[PDB]
Ligand binder design. Structure first.
Ligand SMILES: CCCNC(=O)c1cn2ncnc(Nc3cc(C(=O)Nc4ccon4)ccc3C)c2c1C
Length: 335
């Protein structure tokens, strides 16, 4: 039976939600709400114009397919998905509900020089969630402190994984900033390295104010590409653009992160390698000695196979919209 919906206007946007969700407060657009069925606080996301472009329509479907197929302690879970629409013809709005967390990594870390055990615990949970996500052949692509939510005791959940496509920039792998012809899952490991460096020092590792500055800040630490990496460039113009870059030697990290745990420095060296092929994976990083006090190979699960044949499809907005409506109708809330 269709619950009763109520309408309200928050910051010039109309929100139409079941009466179950009370006291909506702005935090797609996101509101914190009180779930009257459980007595818990929830985050309700209203997707912005979900079916007004092919990009939006496919991203809407993608979000729902990722959320319905991904179950892990360090990955956000879907509590509810709803629409005020009573039929496919009137289906134009989609709302997604998750648990509301205590805070996002950003506010917790704002120029904070965290303790080593705190860093270990946070990074371990990010890598545990990434191992799982990567095992389903999904790349987060935009991992940053703002999409890493933590409760009051530092238990972490990864948000928005697999959604974005290279359409901040402080956490973006150099191969994306240089627009290399291909990239792998370790694009997320570069982001982990940047977040870990920041947790250890209380400073953003690469705070560029523009694209040119960003590349200069990255390459002055990791160095310009060597002879071995240069050979991996398929085209002459790309190869020639790469050589036009100033020329910088790779810096020693023990010097940059003075006073950090040496195992933390050693792990940062393996995450912040310019050559994507030599960068440590999430599963390999979990086995690193820095995480000796958290690592358990029997409690770092992999994901079930994920059918993403839809990603190669070029469908009309109405087709993406009908596929999304089928996923909304078939949704079964977790117990
Ligand atoms: C200020 C209090 C601390 N902050 C929070 O608790 C919090 C902030 N947010 N912001 C956006 N989405 C959230 N959750 C959310 C996340 C997703 C999501 O991650 N979607 C996808 C798409 C692909 O993979 N995951 C979808 C819908 C929602 C409400 C969310 C939560 C929980």
């Amino acid at each position: 039976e269709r619950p009763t919906f109520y309408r309200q206007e928050l910051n010039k946007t109309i929100w139409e939600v079941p009466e179950r969700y009370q006291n909506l407060s702005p935090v797609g657009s996101v509101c914190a709400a009180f779930d009257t069925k459980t007595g818990l606080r929830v985050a309700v996301k209203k997707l912005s114009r979900p079916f007004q472009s092919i990009i939006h329509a496919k991203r809407t479907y993608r979000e729902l397919r990722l959320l319905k197929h991904m179950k892990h302690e360090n990955v956000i879970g879907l509590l509810d998905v709803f629409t005020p629409a009573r039929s496919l013809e009137e289906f134009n709005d989609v709302y997604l509900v998750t648990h509301l967390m205590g805070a996002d990594l950003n506010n917790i870390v704002k120029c904070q020089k965290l303790t080593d055990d705190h860093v270990q615990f946070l990074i371990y949970q990010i890598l545990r969630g990434l191992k799982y996500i990567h095992s389903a052949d999904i790349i987060h692509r935009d991992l940053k402190p703002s999409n890493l939510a933590v409760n009051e005791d530092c238990e972490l959940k990864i948000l928005d994984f697999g959604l974005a496509r290279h359409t901040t920039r402080w956490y973006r792998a150099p191969e994306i900033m240089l627009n290399w012809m291909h990239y792998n899952q370790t694009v997320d490991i570069w982001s982990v390295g940047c977040i870990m460096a920041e947790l250890l020092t209380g400073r953003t590792l690469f705070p560029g104010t523009d694209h040119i500055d960003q590349l200069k800040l990255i390459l002055r630490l990791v160095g310009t590409p060597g002879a071995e990496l240069l050979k991996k460039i398929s085209s002459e113009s790309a190869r020639n653009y790469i050589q036009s870059l100033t020329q910088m030697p790779k810096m020693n990290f023990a010097n940059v992160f003075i006073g950090a745990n040496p195992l933390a420095v050693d792990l940062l060296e393996k995450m912040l390698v310019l050559d994507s092929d030599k960068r440590i994976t999430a599963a390999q990083a979990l086995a690193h000695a820095y995480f000796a006090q958290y690592h358990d190979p029997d409690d770092e699960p992999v994901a079930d196979p994920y059918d993403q044949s839809f990603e190669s499809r070029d469908l009309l907005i109405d087709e993406w919209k009908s596929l999304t409506y089928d996923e909304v109708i078939s949704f079964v809330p977790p117990p």
